């Protein structure tokens, strides 16, 4: 018999993104080639099958630095990290291939699905 | 020119609640009288003006245990912690006074607003 606040989840995600922009309580650095991305482990886990697996591992859960596969493009990662914290995906003709490949590696099934749909249309 | 995934924020919150139920990456214990509640500092901050102030403090940001004011009712806190992680508020005739008082202390303005509306109707 609960009541529900429709905007609560969106408001929570907006505040988590504000904490990210101000580098508050970030507990991991994701290294992609020369580029470094600070984030919250819990948000990464909530969005990605790969980060979920990494941070539930009894040894890796304690690492402050995670290095991604050298094939991963920093721009594709940046677009996906922004999507994790906002629900908004900056999908463009020039980045769609790098975004889909990064989403497949990160195991972000809904992003992979829209990339496949957008590629099929063109 | 971004696209948006409507269910993303709700799905993120659902996964953060699953991490909470399994005690994964919880980094704080909130003590309310004899009762203890494990949570994620970032989620508490995103939902509450009080926790936002506590964990942005250069000294308190590093505490693993936070003790609430002895006037705070553990059941009222439990109902509010559940709302933080689900958007669902278990508001009942028998708990509305304890929930409103706890939401005022935690600085959760939308919960305070619905409690005031529900009290006014009766």
């Amino acid at each position: 018999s609960c009541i529900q606040f429709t905007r609560h989840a969106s408001d929570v995600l907006l505040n988590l993104n504000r904490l990210r922009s101000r580098d508050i309580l970030t507990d991991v650095v994701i290294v992609v080639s020369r580029e470094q991305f600070r984030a919250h482990k819990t948000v990464l886990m909530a969005c990605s099958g790969l980060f979920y697996s990494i941070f539930t591992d009894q040894l890796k859960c304690n690492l402050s630095v995670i290095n991604l596969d050298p094939e991963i493009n920093p721009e594709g990662f940046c677009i996906l990290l922004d999507f994790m914290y906002t629900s908004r995906l900056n999908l463009r003709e020039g980045n769609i291939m790098a975004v889909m490949a990064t989403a497949m590696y990160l195991q972000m099934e809904h992003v992979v699905d829209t990339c496949r749909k957008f590629i099929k249309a063109s | 020119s971004c696209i948006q995934f409507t269910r993303h924020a709700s799905d993120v919150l659902l996964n953060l609640n699953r991490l909470r139920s399994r005690d994964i990456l919880t980094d704080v214990v909130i003590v309310v009288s004899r009762e203890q509640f494990r949570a994620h500092k970032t989620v508490l901050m995103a939902c509450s003006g009080l926790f936002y102030s506590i964990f942005t403090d250069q000294l308190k940001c590093n505490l693993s245990v936070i003790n609430l004011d002895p006037e705070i009712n553990p059941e009222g806190f439990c109902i509010l912690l559940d709302f933080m992680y689900t958007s669902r508020l278990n508001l009942r005739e028998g708990n509305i006074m304890a929930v409103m008082a706890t939401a005022m202390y935690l600085q959760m303005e939308h919960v305070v607003d619905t409690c005031r509306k529900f009290i006014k109707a009766s």
Partner: peptide, 4 residues
């Protein structure tokens, strides 16, 4: 607020 809604009835979910």
């Amino acid at each position: 607020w809604v009835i979910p």
